[PDB]
Amino acid sequence: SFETRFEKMDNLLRDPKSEVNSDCLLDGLDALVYDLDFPALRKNKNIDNFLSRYKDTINKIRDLRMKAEDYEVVKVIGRGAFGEVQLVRHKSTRKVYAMKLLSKFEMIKRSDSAFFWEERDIMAFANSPWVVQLFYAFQDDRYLYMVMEYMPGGDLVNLMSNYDVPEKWARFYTAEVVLALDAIHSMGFIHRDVKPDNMLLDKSGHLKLADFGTCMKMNKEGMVRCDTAVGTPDYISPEVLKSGYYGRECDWWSVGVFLYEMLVGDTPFYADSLVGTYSKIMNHKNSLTFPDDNDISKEAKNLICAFLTDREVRLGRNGVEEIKRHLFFKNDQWAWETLRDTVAPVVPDLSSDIDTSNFDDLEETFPIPKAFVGNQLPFVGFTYYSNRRY
């Protein structure tokens, strides 16, 4: 029907999950205006006139929509592969957030992924206390910005480097990681890179996963067919490393590595060279050993080994409930169903809404195109602002 058509077409500009919603549409025009404003291209009149026409309009759009200058940068709280994360304060709302910047130039220069796409979707729509939340996603001619809730507790790498983690704490953190990974698996994703670096702590000391750079969607039979290895050298599972066809079992390998590192102090397959770490991983059968540690309980050693085995015998091959049922978790302080409502082992004592004490101390683009390059095309639709899921 004529009505049906205009209704169906209408829901398409509203749906935050739609490829053609106002957010993508605005981005698309904003992209064209950016990718064409060069003298060599402006020599063509169709181009010159189009730009000259939308000049006054596109600037209004640019000022009205979310821009980076809307945020006052408090401190650079982190640095990664393709950009930097920063504690910011939205100048108008005076609200405090953690903002992940991703250099559009850097990614384009042999990025090979489009990794930020599921990183956006997961954070934007997860709706889990276990996933860091995306409030706004916006861009410009140089970067991709992710405006997420700030985790003042810092990461697990910081906790571990400041405490000799008692088993009682390791139990809590491991358990929370199990709940957190399960949530991601339920969303249909395999995390592919579970490490302390991605474990973040809130105002209350409770866990959230961040940086789903490596996330991939599981197929019909809960598998991923990635022909190349993905992850971190110590936490990588041997199956992922060799590749390949694999399942969620790989994220449990990583849990075992994390449990080991917390209680032992080092990674189970650590070796001088990164190649030596790879070697030790492939020989997990004979390389996994425990020091003379009267502290590491029989159950913990069992759990570590139940996760640090070949995929086919891994704890978690038959689901989370077999991990949950493990005696290591048997305790009188929390129940799985209410674990995040219990009181954390390390409650952060914070000085302000901008206390950066749990984050270590910290502080070029594409050339002018000869012809049409379309450098801003692979980022059309990244904006999460005009049409969001409230």
Ligand X SMILES: COc1cccc(CC(=O)Nc2nc(-c3ccncc3)cs2)c1
After which residues do gaps appear in the chain, with C to N over 2.5 Å? Answer: 243, 363
Taking CB under 8 A as the rule, does residue 137 contact its own copies? no
Angle between helices 249-264 and 167-186 (to 10 degrees): 160
| Catalytic residue flag (residue 193) | yes
Name the residue among 169, 171, 184, 170 with its Cα closest to residue 131.
Answer: 184
Tokens of 19: 């490829």
CA angle in degrees (0–180, nearest 5) for 282-287-292: 155
Taking CB under 8 A as the rule, does residue 346 contact its own copies? no
Whole-number minimum distance, CB 43 to ligand X, in Å? 29
Taking CB under 8 A as the rule, does residue 28 contact its own copies? yes
8 A C-beta contact, residue 86 and residue 101: yes
Based on CB atoms, which residue is closest to ligand X, 87 or 323? 87
How far is the C-alpha of 208 from the C-alpha of 274, rounded, in Å? Answer: 28
Residue 217 labeled ligand binder: no
Out of 155, 193, 202, 211, which one is annotated catalytic? 193
Longest CA–CA separation in the chain, Å: 79
Residue 77 labeled ligand binder: yes
Selected from 151, 165, 262, 308, the binder of ligand X by CB under 6 A is 151
How far is the C-alpha of 58 from the C-alpha of 161, rounded, in Å? Answer: 49
Binding-residue pattern over the window 46 to 65 for its own copies, x denoting contact by CB under 8 A: xx-xx--xx--x--xx--xx
Size of the site for its own copies (CB under 8 A): 48
Q: Name the residues that contact ligand X, by CB under 6 A.
A: 77-85, 98, 100, 102, 132, 148, 150-151, 200, 210-211, 213
Q: Name the residues that contact its own copies, by CB under 8 A.
A: 1-2, 5-6, 8-10, 12-13, 19-20, 22, 24-26, 28-29, 32, 36, 41, 44, 46-47, 49-50, 53-54, 57, 60-61, 64-65, 70, 90, 92-93, 108, 114, 371-375, 377-378, 380, 385-386
